[PDB]
């Protein structure tokens, strides 16, 4: 019944190709709208990483969200959020979304 | 020493080779070893994010603008295939920009 929407921070599963490895779970910032995400079972999302290094495509998250770490704006990727059991953690404010879209837009060569 | 540039159609081992349209520029791609690229498919299913490649480019079929992703191109042995026309690159950027909520 949950459909991720633009600005959602979701918990996403990943399972190493190597079956003996545990794998686990990473948060991701959703950029694509629920109008696309719901019917396709896909979404465009940016991974959140625990380790901030000052990398220029890092987008910091405000503490109140209780998602730690930074969004990697340039690591945006098509993901199947149903197969990866997306669960909502929080929603990023509009300003986070504008920073991620401005940096990613710059990299993709957007008008 | 090939570095993928924006508009390049490249082979990727993503052995098991498939074509892709590169959206990110060489200045980014060569420094990071990563790139933003959309996969190319043999066939139009006809859904809204398909951008058809013009006939006789040396690669055939359709760019999936909604399947854009960051990947390591160095490990996947990227080799240049062809160059998309300006209008195909702009159409892929238009459709992907709209999906990513850019305005």
């Amino acid at each position: 019944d949950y459909v991720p929407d633009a600005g959602h921070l979701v918990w996403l599963n990943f399972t190493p190709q190597a079956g003996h490895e545990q794998g686990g779970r990473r948060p991701a910032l959703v950029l694509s709208p629920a109008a696309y995400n719901g019917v396709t079972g896909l979404m465009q999302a940016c991974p959140v990483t625990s380790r901030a290094k000052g990398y220029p495509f890092e987008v910091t998250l405000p503490a109140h969200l209780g998602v730690s770490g930074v969004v990697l704006a340039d690591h945006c990727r098509s993901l199947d959020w149903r197969s990866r059991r997306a669960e909502q953690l929080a929603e990023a404010p509009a300003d986070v979304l504008a920073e991620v879209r401005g940096k990613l837009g710059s990299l993709l060569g957007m008008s | 020493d090939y570095v993928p540039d924006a508009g390049h159609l490249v082979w990727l081992n993503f052995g098991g080779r498939r074509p892709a349209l590169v959206l990110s520029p060489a200045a980014y791609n060569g420094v990071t070893g990563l790139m933003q690229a959309c996969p190319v498919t043999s066939r139009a299913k006809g859904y809204p994010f398909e951008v058809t490649l013009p006939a006789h480019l040396g690669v055939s079929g359709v760019v999936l603008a909604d399947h854009c992703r960051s990947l390591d191109w160095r490990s996947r042995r990227a080799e240049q295939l062809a160059e998309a026309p300006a209008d195909v690159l702009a159409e892929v950027r238009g459709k992907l920009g709209s999906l990513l909520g850019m305005s």
Partner: peptide, 30 residues
């Protein structure tokens, strides 16, 4: 955002490797 201003800040020290999403899942094309 100016891409050149962004690229100018990148160093071997702050570079992130490819984010590992493990195996292809469901309808992922790649």
């Amino acid at each position: 955002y100016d891409l050149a201003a962004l690229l100018a800040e990148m160093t071997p020290e702050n570079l992130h490797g490819e984010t590992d999403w493990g195996a292809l899942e469901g309808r992922e094309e790649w």
